[PDB]
């Protein structure tokens, strides 16, 4: 797995389960084209987005539907979603992690 | 101001100065329209983006140009930028502070909304 | 002030008001000695903890009573408190801002140090 | 494993390796007594601190030597260490995660 996403809930201290995640890659006309998508597991993880074959150098956007997550819990959150945008410069594994709260989120990249 | 942006640097323990910020508003033809832009001050703050009159209900995107910030300090960070997307003023006028704390491979954002 | 503390609430999108804060200084008999304490204001800030004269070089511990904060809002959080321990003024006098962003099972802290 | 610690480096986007971690449990005279310790692995993880037998209800302190980590990298950091203090109320697995930067850290508890 060259690309994994992991989502945590900072309020309840749990994985954030069943969170929709959409991945886009930048096209040569500077528009976003769908690339991969999924829902986080019981462990708050999403694997199997891509193969190494398909995950070439490029600019990618990882969109996490945080709003639906919080609304399902009876909480009116601040953000519409959380978006993580990065170049994969693949030269010399990417884990995109997000930690969520209703009015706040943090994200880090672990690249190994 | 009804909309303020504050940016801190987690590596240097400092305000993040001269960070470019672009604000867009969703135009319901569903494209992002330019709304306001500016650069953070020596205190890492950006005020004067808009007036209460102009800051109507809508979905807004605050784009913080983190990459140009780290690169200007001569290094190569992970993210292209940090974006914060939210609905504003949908239960009437509020004051919004969008805060960001930056590291080369990580950032945090939070909103302070007062009435 | 040479030492200020600011606390935000990530669940409510608000300053964290009336949070108790205790500051201690290591006494080199190696016990923590009381230094200053206070409660955050309606803006989530705490000033007036010390003077430049009294804030000498040393190792300081800033203890933020997060548990009493969440419990006062009627819930049961994970941490007992959030502590921030640092050496101060060891390359001469600086101004320190200790900031914390709080959730029931998580917190973040950062320092802004200016000259 | 009832207690795991995981440490990440927010600057470099990597696990924080070889970081010393000391765990204390509160004694009945309101003093801290050593409980468990270790160094993070190549994956930035520390397991095998405790058994379920030994990990009874109590107040625990997890101390992460962040200062040595940053100094070894040629960076003068702000904090002496990062301390995480919590009651384990074990009634109905604890993962203590920390994300580090020279002047900042975040910590979250994932309790499953
Ligand atoms: O902001 C983050 O994505 C973050 C992520 C963290 C993790 C650490 C370790 C693991 Cl396995 C997963 C996650 Cl989401 C810890 C703290 C954080 O602030
Ligand atoms: O996540 C943030 O953007 C953040 C923002 C913080 C602030 C607190 C107070 C002020 Cl005035 C400004 C900022 Cl950026 C403190 C900690 C944080 O983690």
Tab-separated table of C-alpha atoms and ligand atoms in Angstrom:
chain	number	residue	atom	x	y	z
A	1	UNK	CA	0.000	0.000	0.000
A	2	UNK	CA	1.659	3.206	-1.194
A	3	UNK	CA	-1.151	5.362	0.268
A	4	UNK	CA	-3.063	4.861	3.496
A	5	UNK	CA	-5.445	7.180	5.379
A	6	UNK	CA	-6.123	7.016	9.098
A	7	UNK	CA	-8.733	9.044	11.000
A	8	UNK	CA	-9.055	9.544	14.739
A	9	UNK	CA	-11.720	11.185	16.883
A	10	UNK	CA	-10.214	13.543	19.459
A	11	UNK	CA	-13.420	13.980	21.407
A	12	UNK	CA	-14.214	10.358	22.143
A	13	UNK	CA	-10.663	8.971	21.895
A	14	UNK	CA	-11.499	6.427	19.245
A	15	UNK	CA	-10.941	5.638	15.636
A	16	UNK	CA	-13.264	7.603	13.417
A	17	UNK	CA	-15.285	4.834	11.743
A	18	UNK	CA	-17.268	4.911	8.480
A	19	UNK	CA	-15.812	8.258	7.404
A	20	UNK	CA	-15.978	8.846	3.608
A	21	UNK	CA	-12.663	9.696	1.976
A	22	UNK	CA	-12.244	10.849	-1.650
A	23	UNK	CA	-8.886	11.130	-3.399
A	24	UNK	CA	-8.246	13.273	-6.487
A	25	UNK	CA	-5.192	13.739	-8.683
A	26	UNK	CA	-4.491	17.032	-10.463
A	27	UNK	CA	-5.057	16.899	-14.250
A	28	UNK	CA	-2.934	18.749	-16.859
A	29	UNK	CA	-5.686	21.404	-17.193
A	30	UNK	CA	-5.376	22.266	-13.456
A	31	UNK	CA	-8.638	20.500	-12.546
A	32	UNK	CA	-9.247	17.716	-10.015
A	33	UNK	CA	-10.101	14.247	-11.377
A	34	UNK	CA	-11.388	11.405	-9.168
A	35	UNK	CA	-8.699	8.900	-8.271
A	36	UNK	CA	-9.751	6.706	-5.367
A	37	UNK	CA	-12.297	6.616	-2.548
A	38	UNK	CA	-13.528	4.613	0.377
A	39	UNK	CA	-14.816	4.581	3.931
A	40	UNK	CA	-12.662	4.175	7.058
A	41	UNK	CA	-12.823	0.798	8.765
A	42	UNK	CA	-13.535	-0.076	12.376
A	43	UNK	CA	-9.899	0.757	13.048
A	44	UNK	CA	-10.334	4.190	11.455
A	45	UNK	CA	-8.102	3.118	8.559
A	46	UNK	CA	-8.480	3.107	4.805
A	47	UNK	CA	-6.178	0.853	2.754
A	48	UNK	CA	-6.311	-0.416	-0.824
A	49	UNK	CA	-6.776	2.948	-2.398
A	50	UNK	CA	-3.993	2.431	-5.022
A	51	UNK	CA	-1.284	0.173	-6.324
A	52	UNK	CA	2.308	1.407	-6.736
A	53	UNK	CA	1.784	1.085	-10.505
A	54	UNK	CA	-1.026	3.701	-10.459
A	55	UNK	CA	0.391	5.996	-7.776
A	56	UNK	CA	2.721	8.079	-9.919
A	57	UNK	CA	4.245	11.513	-9.154
A	58	UNK	CA	1.608	14.186	-9.139
A	59	UNK	CA	-0.452	16.491	-6.979
A	60	UNK	CA	-3.110	14.740	-4.945
A	61	UNK	CA	-6.026	15.851	-2.797
A	62	UNK	CA	-7.386	13.778	0.009
A	63	UNK	CA	-10.833	14.878	1.064
A	64	UNK	CA	-12.284	13.619	4.375
A	65	UNK	CA	-16.046	14.093	4.940
A	66	UNK	CA	-15.800	15.247	8.528
A	67	UNK	CA	-19.147	17.047	8.434
A	68	UNK	CA	-21.180	13.851	7.951
A	69	UNK	CA	-19.200	12.159	10.724
A	70	UNK	CA	-20.058	14.840	13.305
A	71	UNK	CA	-23.663	15.234	12.152
A	72	UNK	CA	-24.280	11.495	12.660
A	73	UNK	CA	-23.178	11.990	16.272
A	74	UNK	CA	-25.596	14.923	16.851
A	75	UNK	CA	-22.868	17.560	16.672
A	76	UNK	CA	-22.953	20.632	14.436
A	77	UNK	CA	-19.372	20.935	13.255
A	78	UNK	CA	-17.480	23.872	11.807
A	79	UNK	CA	-15.845	22.480	8.659
A	80	UNK	CA	-17.469	21.209	5.488
A	81	UNK	CA	-14.682	18.657	5.194
A	82	UNK	CA	-10.945	18.317	5.721
A	83	UNK	CA	-8.740	18.430	2.638
A	84	UNK	CA	-5.111	17.425	2.489
A	85	UNK	CA	-3.233	18.501	-0.687
A	86	UNK	CA	0.280	17.330	-1.479
A	87	UNK	CA	2.756	16.417	-4.217
A	88	UNK	CA	3.869	12.793	-4.183
A	89	UNK	CA	7.527	13.148	-5.283
A	90	UNK	CA	8.285	9.450	-5.166
A	91	UNK	CA	12.046	9.410	-5.454
A	92	UNK	CA	13.720	7.710	-2.542
A	93	UNK	CA	4.762	4.602	1.646
A	94	UNK	CA	2.503	7.624	2.459
A	95	UNK	CA	0.229	7.625	5.489
A	96	UNK	CA	-2.095	10.602	5.762
A	97	UNK	CA	-3.406	10.861	9.316
A	98	UNK	CA	-6.160	13.214	10.562
A	99	UNK	CA	-7.271	13.903	14.153
A	100	UNK	CA	-10.752	15.413	14.378
A	101	UNK	CA	-12.765	17.642	16.618
A	102	UNK	CA	-15.896	19.590	15.876
A	103	UNK	CA	-14.132	22.941	15.439
A	104	UNK	CA	-10.622	21.711	14.727
A	105	UNK	CA	-8.513	19.168	12.958
A	106	UNK	CA	-4.881	18.251	12.637
A	107	UNK	CA	-3.178	16.320	9.871
A	108	UNK	CA	0.273	14.824	9.494
A	109	UNK	CA	2.014	12.822	6.769
A	110	UNK	CA	4.172	9.845	7.685
A	111	UNK	CA	6.332	9.012	4.707
A	112	UNK	CA	8.469	5.881	5.052
B	1	UNK	CA	-13.275	42.307	11.912
B	2	UNK	CA	-15.770	39.576	11.102
B	3	UNK	CA	-12.981	37.370	9.629
B	4	UNK	CA	-9.424	37.099	10.926
B	5	UNK	CA	-6.656	34.602	10.263
B	6	UNK	CA	-3.781	33.790	12.624
B	7	UNK	CA	-0.816	31.555	11.761
B	8	UNK	CA	1.914	30.211	14.077
B	9	UNK	CA	5.118	28.327	13.340
B	10	UNK	CA	5.730	25.180	15.394
B	11	UNK	CA	9.350	24.760	14.328
B	12	UNK	CA	10.543	28.252	15.300
B	13	UNK	CA	8.093	29.051	18.058
B	14	UNK	CA	7.061	32.266	16.339
B	15	UNK	CA	4.244	33.945	14.500
B	16	UNK	CA	4.275	32.835	10.880
B	17	UNK	CA	4.992	36.191	9.129
B	18	UNK	CA	4.246	37.020	5.484
B	19	UNK	CA	2.144	33.970	4.837
B	20	UNK	CA	-0.144	34.487	1.801
B	21	UNK	CA	-3.812	33.767	2.425
B	22	UNK	CA	-6.550	33.580	-0.233
B	23	UNK	CA	-10.234	33.479	0.641
B	24	UNK	CA	-12.877	32.234	-1.851
B	25	UNK	CA	-16.665	32.009	-1.683
B	26	UNK	CA	-18.683	29.291	-3.372
B	27	UNK	CA	-20.749	30.877	-6.159
B	28	UNK	CA	-23.557	28.270	-6.398
B	29	UNK	CA	-22.862	27.840	-10.052
B	30	UNK	CA	-20.676	25.851	-7.674
B	31	UNK	CA	-17.308	27.323	-8.598
B	32	UNK	CA	-15.027	29.059	-6.115
B	33	UNK	CA	-15.040	32.837	-6.546
B	34	UNK	CA	-12.254	35.116	-5.237
B	35	UNK	CA	-13.345	36.892	-2.043
B	36	UNK	CA	-10.332	38.441	-0.284
B	37	UNK	CA	-6.605	37.907	0.118
B	38	UNK	CA	-3.725	39.228	2.182
B	39	UNK	CA	-0.475	38.377	3.991
B	40	UNK	CA	0.021	37.805	7.701
B	41	UNK	CA	1.688	40.534	9.705
B	42	UNK	CA	4.711	40.476	11.981
B	43	UNK	CA	2.287	39.097	14.636
B	44	UNK	CA	1.113	36.328	12.255
B	45	UNK	CA	-2.320	37.933	11.952
B	46	UNK	CA	-4.383	38.957	8.981
B	47	UNK	CA	-7.274	41.418	9.503
B	48	UNK	CA	-9.241	43.647	7.156
B	49	UNK	CA	-10.232	40.890	4.751
B	50	UNK	CA	-13.879	41.896	4.587
B	51	UNK	CA	-16.719	43.910	6.031
B	52	UNK	CA	-19.801	42.615	7.778
B	53	UNK	CA	-21.849	43.906	4.817
B	54	UNK	CA	-19.844	41.951	2.259
B	55	UNK	CA	-19.434	38.784	4.382
B	56	UNK	CA	-22.803	37.285	3.654
B	57	UNK	CA	-23.979	33.735	4.282
B	58	UNK	CA	-22.040	31.288	2.200
B	59	UNK	CA	-19.458	28.511	2.004
B	60	UNK	CA	-15.980	29.976	2.286
B	61	UNK	CA	-12.540	28.497	1.609
B	62	UNK	CA	-9.524	29.976	3.407
B	63	UNK	CA	-6.367	28.827	1.633
B	64	UNK	CA	-3.102	29.314	3.540
B	65	UNK	CA	-0.020	29.129	1.308
B	66	UNK	CA	2.124	26.966	3.603
B	67	UNK	CA	4.356	25.710	0.810
B	68	UNK	CA	5.512	29.231	-0.244
B	69	UNK	CA	6.151	29.882	3.493
B	70	UNK	CA	8.434	26.897	4.120
B	71	UNK	CA	10.143	27.280	0.731
B	72	UNK	CA	10.843	30.986	1.453
B	73	UNK	CA	12.665	29.693	4.551
B	74	UNK	CA	14.561	27.516	2.114
B	75	UNK	CA	13.051	24.053	2.654
B	76	UNK	CA	10.737	21.590	0.946
B	77	UNK	CA	7.489	20.864	2.878
B	78	UNK	CA	4.865	18.128	2.376
B	79	UNK	CA	1.640	20.014	1.757
B	80	UNK	CA	0.829	22.357	-1.129
B	81	UNK	CA	-1.231	24.546	1.127
B	82	UNK	CA	-3.659	24.289	4.047
B	83	UNK	CA	-7.366	24.870	3.244
B	84	UNK	CA	-10.143	25.514	5.686
B	85	UNK	CA	-13.695	25.243	4.263
B	86	UNK	CA	-16.752	26.246	6.209
B	87	UNK	CA	-20.246	27.682	6.098
B	88	UNK	CA	-20.456	31.137	7.600
B	89	UNK	CA	-23.254	33.351	8.885
B	90	UNK	CA	-25.998	30.799	8.431
B	91	UNK	CA	-27.458	31.502	11.883
B	92	UNK	CA	-26.790	35.238	11.469
B	93	UNK	CA	-23.563	37.276	11.734
B	94	UNK	CA	-20.666	35.878	13.770
B	95	UNK	CA	-16.989	36.810	14.197
B	96	UNK	CA	-14.654	34.092	12.903
B	97	UNK	CA	-11.010	33.528	13.769
B	98	UNK	CA	-9.278	30.850	11.667
B	99	UNK	CA	-6.044	29.783	13.402
B	100	UNK	CA	-3.337	27.485	11.960
B	101	UNK	CA	-0.260	25.965	13.517
B	102	UNK	CA	2.324	24.891	10.956
B	103	UNK	CA	5.147	22.294	10.644
B	104	UNK	CA	6.703	21.077	7.477
B	105	UNK	CA	4.845	17.663	7.440
B	106	UNK	CA	1.870	18.620	9.654
B	107	UNK	CA	-0.594	21.365	10.424
B	108	UNK	CA	-3.494	21.994	12.776
B	109	UNK	CA	-6.378	24.356	12.345
B	110	UNK	CA	-9.103	25.557	14.674
B	111	UNK	CA	-11.915	28.066	14.520
B	112	UNK	CA	-13.041	30.454	17.186
B	113	UNK	CA	-16.564	31.676	16.522
B	114	UNK	CA	-18.068	34.386	18.723
B	115	UNK	CA	-21.342	36.338	18.670
C	1	UNK	CA	3.761	40.402	30.302
C	2	UNK	CA	6.745	38.075	30.136
C	3	UNK	CA	4.465	35.007	30.590
C	4	UNK	CA	0.975	34.582	29.158
C	5	UNK	CA	-1.259	31.552	28.754
C	6	UNK	CA	-4.017	31.154	26.160
C	7	UNK	CA	-6.486	28.252	26.031
C	8	UNK	CA	-9.003	27.378	23.287
C	9	UNK	CA	-11.775	24.799	23.162
C	10	UNK	CA	-11.869	22.578	20.071
C	11	UNK	CA	-15.309	21.133	20.778
C	12	UNK	CA	-17.159	24.452	21.121
C	13	UNK	CA	-14.999	26.650	18.941
C	14	UNK	CA	-14.517	29.135	21.761
C	15	UNK	CA	-11.994	30.506	24.189
C	16	UNK	CA	-11.691	28.154	27.140
C	17	UNK	CA	-12.953	30.432	29.980
C	18	UNK	CA	-12.243	29.980	33.697
C	19	UNK	CA	-9.593	27.351	33.247
C	20	UNK	CA	-7.332	27.124	36.339
C	21	UNK	CA	-3.619	27.375	35.624
C	22	UNK	CA	-0.801	26.729	38.122
C	23	UNK	CA	2.805	27.639	37.404
C	24	UNK	CA	5.719	26.073	39.354
C	25	UNK	CA	9.476	26.630	39.249
C	26	UNK	CA	12.020	23.902	39.887
C	27	UNK	CA	13.855	24.701	43.135
C	28	UNK	CA	17.103	22.755	42.494
C	29	UNK	CA	16.629	20.888	45.705
C	30	UNK	CA	14.765	19.550	42.684
C	31	UNK	CA	11.218	19.928	43.965
C	32	UNK	CA	8.569	22.005	42.219
C	33	UNK	CA	7.900	25.290	44.014
C	34	UNK	CA	4.696	27.334	43.539
C	35	UNK	CA	5.327	30.332	41.268
C	36	UNK	CA	2.018	31.836	40.098
C	37	UNK	CA	-1.558	30.810	39.395
C	38	UNK	CA	-4.704	32.244	37.863
C	39	UNK	CA	-7.803	31.536	35.752
C	40	UNK	CA	-8.317	32.293	32.078
C	41	UNK	CA	-10.529	35.211	31.165
C	42	UNK	CA	-13.569	35.439	28.922
C	43	UNK	CA	-11.028	35.610	26.033
C	44	UNK	CA	-9.280	32.426	27.265
C	45	UNK	CA	-6.193	34.410	28.261
C	46	UNK	CA	-4.250	34.627	31.471
C	47	UNK	CA	-1.883	37.594	31.998
C	48	UNK	CA	-0.279	39.122	35.070
C	49	UNK	CA	1.289	35.907	36.321
C	50	UNK	CA	4.691	37.435	36.975
C	51	UNK	CA	7.057	40.327	36.479
C	52	UNK	CA	10.261	40.360	34.488
C	53	UNK	CA	12.140	40.822	37.787
C	54	UNK	CA	10.623	37.727	39.370
C	55	UNK	CA	10.729	35.550	36.215
C	56	UNK	CA	14.340	34.537	36.458
C	57	UNK	CA	16.128	31.753	34.607
C	58	UNK	CA	14.749	28.397	35.568
C	59	UNK	CA	12.733	25.319	34.634
C	60	UNK	CA	9.037	26.116	34.789
C	61	UNK	CA	5.955	23.884	34.750
C	62	UNK	CA	2.656	25.338	33.518
C	63	UNK	CA	-0.169	23.054	34.629
C	64	UNK	CA	-3.535	23.599	32.921
C	65	UNK	CA	-6.448	22.038	34.816
C	66	UNK	CA	-8.236	20.519	31.810
C	67	UNK	CA	-10.097	17.933	33.860
C	68	UNK	CA	-11.845	20.537	36.097
C	69	UNK	CA	-12.725	22.392	32.844
C	70	UNK	CA	-14.439	19.483	31.079
C	71	UNK	CA	-16.068	18.265	34.307
C	72	UNK	CA	-17.465	21.779	34.979
C	73	UNK	CA	-19.127	21.408	31.560
C	74	UNK	CA	-20.500	18.175	32.952
C	75	UNK	CA	-18.397	15.498	31.226
C	76	UNK	CA	-15.609	13.052	31.987
C	77	UNK	CA	-12.353	13.702	30.040
C	78	UNK	CA	-9.254	11.510	29.590
C	79	UNK	CA	-6.412	13.594	30.976
C	80	UNK	CA	-5.945	14.813	34.550
C	81	UNK	CA	-4.406	18.020	33.336
C	82	UNK	CA	-2.079	19.311	30.615
C	83	UNK	CA	1.485	20.229	31.708
C	84	UNK	CA	4.006	22.228	29.777
C	85	UNK	CA	7.595	22.112	31.125
C	86	UNK	CA	10.344	24.308	29.796
C	87	UNK	CA	13.514	26.220	30.554
C	88	UNK	CA	13.030	29.960	30.442
C	89	UNK	CA	15.323	32.968	30.165
C	90	UNK	CA	18.505	30.982	29.743
C	91	UNK	CA	19.687	33.165	26.848
C	92	UNK	CA	18.356	36.292	28.587
C	93	UNK	CA	14.800	37.652	28.978
C	94	UNK	CA	12.140	36.595	26.467
C	95	UNK	CA	8.342	36.922	26.284
C	96	UNK	CA	6.596	33.538	26.399
C	97	UNK	CA	3.090	32.671	25.257
C	98	UNK	CA	1.959	29.137	26.160
C	99	UNK	CA	-1.083	28.208	24.040
C	100	UNK	CA	-3.266	25.083	24.435
C	101	UNK	CA	-6.063	23.705	22.317
C	102	UNK	CA	-8.312	21.305	24.208
C	103	UNK	CA	-10.594	18.303	23.439
C	104	UNK	CA	-11.785	15.739	25.875
C	105	UNK	CA	-9.329	12.958	24.716
C	106	UNK	CA	-6.662	15.196	23.120
C	107	UNK	CA	-4.776	18.435	23.505
C	108	UNK	CA	-2.128	20.411	21.656
C	109	UNK	CA	0.285	22.936	23.031
C	110	UNK	CA	2.656	25.392	21.408
C	111	UNK	CA	4.960	28.140	22.577
C	112	UNK	CA	5.531	31.507	21.022
C	113	UNK	CA	8.789	33.025	22.215
C	114	UNK	CA	9.688	36.583	21.224
C	115	UNK	CA	12.545	38.946	22.110
D	1	UNK	CA	-1.045	-4.983	25.281
D	2	UNK	CA	-3.224	-2.809	27.514
D	3	UNK	CA	-0.914	0.212	27.052
D	4	UNK	CA	0.942	1.300	23.938
D	5	UNK	CA	2.786	4.548	23.129
D	6	UNK	CA	3.349	5.895	19.639
D	7	UNK	CA	5.471	8.926	18.714
D	8	UNK	CA	5.562	10.821	15.437
D	9	UNK	CA	7.800	13.599	14.146
D	10	UNK	CA	5.795	16.419	12.570
D	11	UNK	CA	8.793	18.127	11.037
D	12	UNK	CA	10.215	15.247	9.044
D	13	UNK	CA	6.992	13.236	8.636
D	14	UNK	CA	8.377	10.095	10.189
D	15	UNK	CA	8.103	7.942	13.229
D	16	UNK	CA	10.102	9.341	16.098
D	17	UNK	CA	12.657	6.574	16.703
D	18	UNK	CA	14.707	5.807	19.833
D	19	UNK	CA	12.697	8.190	22.015
D	20	UNK	CA	12.887	7.355	25.764
D	21	UNK	CA	9.532	6.916	27.476
D	22	UNK	CA	9.038	6.551	31.253
D	23	UNK	CA	5.750	5.542	32.862
D	24	UNK	CA	4.835	6.236	36.498
D	25	UNK	CA	1.828	5.287	38.601
D	26	UNK	CA	0.595	7.500	41.443
D	27	UNK	CA	1.311	6.086	44.932
D	28	UNK	CA	-1.023	6.417	47.963
D	29	UNK	CA	1.202	9.220	49.350
D	30	UNK	CA	0.606	11.327	46.187
D	31	UNK	CA	4.103	10.656	44.805
D	32	UNK	CA	5.124	9.167	41.449
D	33	UNK	CA	6.652	5.661	41.465
D	34	UNK	CA	8.362	4.125	38.411
D	35	UNK	CA	6.151	1.678	36.557
D	36	UNK	CA	7.486	0.946	33.088
D	37	UNK	CA	9.902	2.373	30.527
D	38	UNK	CA	11.377	1.855	27.116
D	39	UNK	CA	12.522	3.375	23.849
D	40	UNK	CA	10.369	3.761	20.718
D	41	UNK	CA	11.089	1.345	17.893
D	42	UNK	CA	11.822	2.012	14.242
D	43	UNK	CA	8.073	2.348	13.796
D	44	UNK	CA	7.923	4.968	16.557
D	45	UNK	CA	6.032	2.511	18.771
D	46	UNK	CA	6.539	1.185	22.267
D	47	UNK	CA	4.768	-2.049	23.259
D	48	UNK	CA	5.260	-4.501	26.118
D	49	UNK	CA	5.151	-1.931	28.838
D	50	UNK	CA	2.607	-3.885	30.985
D	51	UNK	CA	0.409	-6.921	31.265
D	52	UNK	CA	-3.331	-6.612	31.974
D	53	UNK	CA	-2.623	-8.200	35.375
D	54	UNK	CA	-0.348	-5.282	36.397
D	55	UNK	CA	-2.258	-2.463	34.702
D	56	UNK	CA	-4.855	-1.786	37.378
D	57	UNK	CA	-7.013	1.343	37.880
D	58	UNK	CA	-4.917	4.271	38.946
D	59	UNK	CA	-3.395	7.548	37.864
D	60	UNK	CA	-0.535	7.193	35.423
D	61	UNK	CA	2.048	9.536	33.943
D	62	UNK	CA	3.666	8.935	30.620
D	63	UNK	CA	6.812	10.962	30.169
D	64	UNK	CA	8.351	11.305	26.681
D	65	UNK	CA	11.938	12.639	26.465
D	66	UNK	CA	11.355	14.969	23.551
D	67	UNK	CA	14.314	17.191	24.421
D	68	UNK	CA	16.918	14.477	23.763
D	69	UNK	CA	15.186	13.594	20.492
D	70	UNK	CA	15.443	17.147	19.115
D	71	UNK	CA	18.952	17.745	20.459
D	72	UNK	CA	20.229	14.641	18.631
D	73	UNK	CA	18.927	16.221	15.419
D	74	UNK	CA	20.740	19.553	16.050
D	75	UNK	CA	17.580	21.385	17.092
D	76	UNK	CA	17.176	23.374	20.305
D	77	UNK	CA	13.646	22.553	21.386
D	78	UNK	CA	11.297	24.346	23.747
D	79	UNK	CA	10.060	21.614	26.099
D	80	UNK	CA	12.003	19.586	28.633
D	81	UNK	CA	9.747	16.638	27.865
D	82	UNK	CA	6.120	15.833	27.117
D	83	UNK	CA	4.044	14.392	29.944
D	84	UNK	CA	0.671	12.752	29.582
D	85	UNK	CA	-1.260	12.214	32.861
D	86	UNK	CA	-4.466	10.206	33.040
D	87	UNK	CA	-6.631	7.907	35.158
D	88	UNK	CA	-7.057	4.413	33.749
D	89	UNK	CA	-10.676	3.656	34.771
D	90	UNK	CA	-10.742	0.190	33.271
D	91	UNK	CA	-14.419	-0.647	33.390
D	92	UNK	CA	-15.853	-1.430	29.998
D	93	UNK	CA	-6.630	-1.063	25.281
D	94	UNK	CA	-4.998	2.408	25.721
D	95	UNK	CA	-2.873	3.946	22.990
D	96	UNK	CA	-1.150	7.187	23.917
D	97	UNK	CA	-0.036	8.977	20.758
D	98	UNK	CA	2.190	12.088	20.567
D	99	UNK	CA	3.026	14.247	17.526
D	100	UNK	CA	6.158	16.347	17.998
D	101	UNK	CA	7.645	19.575	16.812
D	102	UNK	CA	10.386	21.654	18.331
D	103	UNK	CA	8.051	24.219	19.911
D	104	UNK	CA	4.856	22.188	19.993
D	105	UNK	CA	3.317	18.831	20.623
D	106	UNK	CA	-0.070	17.206	20.454
D	107	UNK	CA	-1.287	14.113	22.249
D	108	UNK	CA	-4.387	11.973	21.924
D	109	UNK	CA	-5.631	8.824	23.654
D	110	UNK	CA	-7.233	6.051	21.628
D	111	UNK	CA	-9.095	3.795	24.009
D	112	UNK	CA	-10.629	0.676	22.458
E	1	LIG	O1	-2.924	15.221	13.394
E	1	LIG	C1	-2.798	14.020	13.287
E	1	LIG	O2	-3.067	13.385	12.106
E	1	LIG	C2	-2.343	13.101	14.401
E	1	LIG	C3	-2.206	11.733	14.187
E	1	LIG	C4	-1.771	10.830	15.211
E	1	LIG	C5	-1.651	9.460	14.974
E	1	LIG	C6	-0.527	8.738	15.526
E	1	LIG	C7	-0.388	7.387	15.311
E	1	LIG	C8	-1.328	6.659	14.544
E	1	LIG	CL1	-1.134	4.929	14.279
E	1	LIG	C9	-2.417	7.336	13.994
E	1	LIG	C10	-2.614	8.690	14.173
E	1	LIG	CL2	-3.999	9.464	13.418
E	1	LIG	C11	-1.489	11.440	16.517
E	1	LIG	C12	-1.628	12.787	16.726
E	1	LIG	C13	-2.045	13.626	15.698
E	1	LIG	O3	-2.188	14.947	15.941
E	2	LIG	O1	-4.469	24.505	15.882
E	2	LIG	C1	-4.246	25.850	15.808
E	2	LIG	O2	-4.406	26.454	14.767
E	2	LIG	C2	-3.792	26.477	17.109
E	2	LIG	C3	-3.914	27.845	17.323
E	2	LIG	C4	-3.506	28.479	18.541
E	2	LIG	C5	-3.631	29.855	18.729
E	2	LIG	C6	-4.062	30.370	20.019
E	2	LIG	C7	-4.189	31.721	20.231
E	2	LIG	C8	-3.909	32.653	19.200
E	2	LIG	CL1	-4.077	34.382	19.489
E	2	LIG	C9	-3.499	32.181	17.944
E	2	LIG	C10	-3.352	30.837	17.668
E	2	LIG	CL2	-2.859	30.332	16.046
E	2	LIG	C11	-2.929	27.589	19.555
E	2	LIG	C12	-2.806	26.241	19.341
E	2	LIG	C13	-3.226	25.671	18.144
E	2	LIG	O3	-3.082	24.289	17.949
